[PDB]
UniProtKB/Swiss-Prot annotation, chains A, B:
The modification N6-acetyllysine is found at residue 17. The gene is CTNNBL1. SMART domains: DUF1716. The modification Phosphoserine is found at residues 315, 471. The keyword Coiled coil applies. This is Beta-catenin-like protein 1. HEAT repeats lie at residues 5-55, 60-102. Widely expressed with highest levels in skeletal muscle, placenta, heart, spleen, testis and thyroid. Residues 402-466 form a coiled coil.
Length: 489, 489
């Protein structure tokens, strides 16, 4: 049973004295013959006892102010890895626990100490030192990643400093490594993902290291045939999540292209199991917005229109065990088109438009089948929200920002994003000067019920939020464009 | 003191027991009443004795393996600044001696230790803490800068890591600070320059922090009137060196343009004393190569042609005490034209060309005056080398790369760069289909001696080296262009 108030103070003092004793025995007998280690074994056992400090109702403030933390890092830079491994292992169990809202006060103080101590850089050096997949050595790398999962997860803002430290560079090394592929390699890609998850610096950085090439090659192997294990799948799927996150950064767009990025995602689509679902999520990303413009053309030049529209006309599977389903697939296809439409110009733009005047514009037919599907949902979803708003008056609950988020998620759940893109697409086709499509769009909207103005309201919403947020100059410049379509339509 | 063997080892051991007794007296009576004061002093005096470790024939290996270094950094993070200031101060002396050769091994061991220890980040944190201009507090910042001078100076590869640490951001803060401006401010700008000196990452970074806006406004104060002191001048001149180093990075170009950077440099040139000389070195930098292209138009749109061509036709000062003179001044004007001619297109390109068909092309006249001037020098310079080459056979000294560097610099000294830019300019004008200029250029080259082919040999040299080097695509695409001129010429 643990119930100690500053008993841990004794624990620290003991740790510090023990470490102190080792340093001077490290100086006394250093030359190649060895008497020191016995000294080492006594001190690491003290760290192991200290391990249980995390379990204690965390008054971590002790650890930092009293310099436990600082000392612990030089341990990370010690000659025998055993004491490094002990420190990392120790360091995992003090960060897994912290997540509990309790002692946010030591966590904040403990976490702060670690980032100022440049924990990742030291950790990375240690990682560098570990080499040979000694089962302890292997476990040590794992626990090193663990730290970063838990640190990252706790204070995410901390990520960028870590990337600079060369963690990213080390991660990319491990993934390229030709060694067979068990859990440690997996866990890299969980961390890689996390590293990039919402962070544009780490995307600038990954890209600057030929890292998109890495990702593509690591995905390339699974191009014709699925993951042998459902553990390796979870990794492939991590490799995507990281590749997509990189695409969101504009400069990776070029680098995606130089790598035969489209060729691959295309191939994965043509050979339709099982990484199909995800490759369509990359494609969409690689074309979205202006920076996508080269890729939008590149896509068409490689018969990307043969690949995509079939998926536009009919979606599967109802249902696959690994879940992509429904609106998820549609949103991806429809976003892909909305990109092509807004971006394409010249010869490839004309090919796109034919595809909309084909089999008597069967694809306009489709678009409208989709339109009404999603509209009905959005309508019904909006009614619910209208009620809750009234209900919120009577209660006297006040609609604030966090109520409006809750409300947003319901509209997205109803396929608001795909509804916008299929209005946008609808509208982009009607300003092409092909009377066929414009007539049909309309012919269908009278038949029945729906106003063309119901659609305009949906564009005006897509447009307001629009690019959120690129430069206002680009925000207000694009928003002009989009509303321009609305006149001729 | 004259002879000391590993006494320094005794010195380290005492330092460590000194830090240790203190940490535990920092834990004993921690609370607001103070009796550790006796303790802090004794350990700090010991650190001070170590100050004399530098003097000793350096076996700095003792300091790193025995963990002197590591411990010192926590001292840097201690609650009384006086112990921090002692640590910086000691560090400065150690690094300064390092400026000397003898401990290549020692520096090599010690420096590594410091950069692994993320010293700048710790140092920056310490700098943040010291705010108040206690003379000791002030002195500490200075010696903190000195570390970076000596560190940077020795192992220059170190800089990018340092910038990341946020030293750059602090420097930018100090420069913008509205306090009057003695030595520490001057020092900052010596360090800034060093930080950017040959390092593209720190230029991406400086720019990323609205830093070019800083620089420009700090230069804007001296726009109409000279620096009061000759110490402040040194700082203005530092502010330029940094601004120019940033401009070598292409992204900074747009940012410079968002700053009224042409307007200001242009003004400084209209009000001809004393920062004129450097303002002309900035313009040149802001226009060189494709990335300049917007600035090249902007320049013409603000009458930059009225400013520059006068300086083209006649130059000063024969000579100013602060020397820009002669070839130095000329290279810059001609580099600026070479840029405008390559870059300008449309309406502004025509104005430029008129300026060359003006007073019977007095400006072509001029160009050829310059041509022959610099050719004479080069010719003479080349003969010398030719001899030196033959003499290097009879000796049996083998011209190698360092001999060819030495040779190169003699050509630059004779004004190779300005010769190239006037041969390019001369050639760029002759492919504009104005028979006047072409005829004259030729009429002057017959009269006398010089072959048009002598010039071609100079383009082929300017072209081979060309952009050295942006990307072998850009390099070979440009080198194509430049030699394209050579046909119709």
């Amino acid at each position: 049973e643990p119930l100690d108030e500053s008993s841990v103070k004794k624990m620290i003092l003991t740790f510090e004295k023990r470490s102190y004793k080792n340093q001077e025995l490290r100086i006394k007998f250093p030359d190649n013959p060895e008497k020191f280690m016995e000294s080492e074994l006594d001190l690491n056992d003290i760290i192991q006892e200290m391990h249980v400090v995390a379990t204690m109702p965390d008054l971590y403030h002790l650890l930092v102010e009293l310099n436990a933390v600082q000392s612990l890092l030089g341990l990370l830079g010690h000659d025998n890895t055993d004491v490094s491994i002990a420190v990392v292992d120790l360091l995992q169990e003090l960060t897994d626990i912290d997540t509990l809202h309790e002692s946010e006060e030591g966590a904040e103080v403990l976490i702060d100490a670690l980032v100022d101590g440049q924990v990742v850089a030291l950790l990375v050096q240690n990682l560098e030192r570990l080499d040979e997949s000694v089962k302890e050595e292997a476990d040590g790398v794992h626990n090193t990643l663990a730290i970063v999962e838990n640190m990252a997860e706790f204070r995410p803002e901390m990520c960028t400093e870590g990337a600079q430290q060369g963690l990213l560079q080390w991660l990319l090394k491990r993934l390229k490594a030709k060694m067979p592929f068990d859990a440690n390699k997996l866990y890299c890609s969980e961390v890689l993902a996390i590293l990039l998850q919402d962070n544009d610096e780490n995307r600038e950085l990954l890209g600057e290291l030929d890292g998109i090439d890495v990702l593509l090659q690591q995905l390339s192997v699974f191009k014709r045939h699925n993951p042998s294990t459902a553990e390796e799948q979870e990794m492939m799927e991590n490799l995507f999540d990281s590749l997509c996150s990189c695409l969101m950064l504009s400069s990776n767009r070029e680098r995606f292209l130089k790598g035969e990025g489209l060729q691959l995602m295309n191939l994965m689509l043509r050979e339709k199991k099982i990484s199909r679902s995800s490759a369509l999520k990359v494609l969409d990303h690689a074309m979205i917005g202006p920076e996508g413009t080269d890729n939008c053309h590149k896509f068409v030049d490689i018969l990307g229109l043969r690949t995509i529209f079939p998926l536009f006309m009919k979606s599967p599977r109802k249902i696959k065990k690994v879940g992509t389903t429904e609106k998820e697939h549609e949103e991806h296809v429809c976003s892909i088109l909305a990109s092509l439409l807004r971006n394409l110009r010249g010869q490839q733009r004309t090919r796109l438009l034919n595809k909309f005047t084909e089999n008597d514009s069967e694809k306009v037919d489709r678009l409208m089948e989709l339109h009404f599907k999603y509209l009905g949902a959005m309508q019904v979803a909006d009614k619910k929200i209208e009620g809750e708003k009234h209900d919120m008056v009577r209660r006297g609950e006040i609609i604030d920002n966090d109520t409006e988020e809750e409300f947003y998620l319901r509209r997205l759940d109803a396929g608001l994003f795909v509804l916008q893109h299929i209005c946008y697409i609808m509208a982009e086709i009607c300003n092409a000067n092909v009377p066929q499509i414009r007539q049909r769009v309309h012919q269908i909207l009278n038949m029945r019920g729906s106003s063309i103005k119901i659609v305009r309201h949906i564009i005006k919403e897509y447009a307001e939020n629009i690019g959120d947020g690129r430069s206002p100059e680009f925000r207000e410049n694009e928003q002009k464009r989009i509303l321009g379509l609305l006149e001729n339509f």
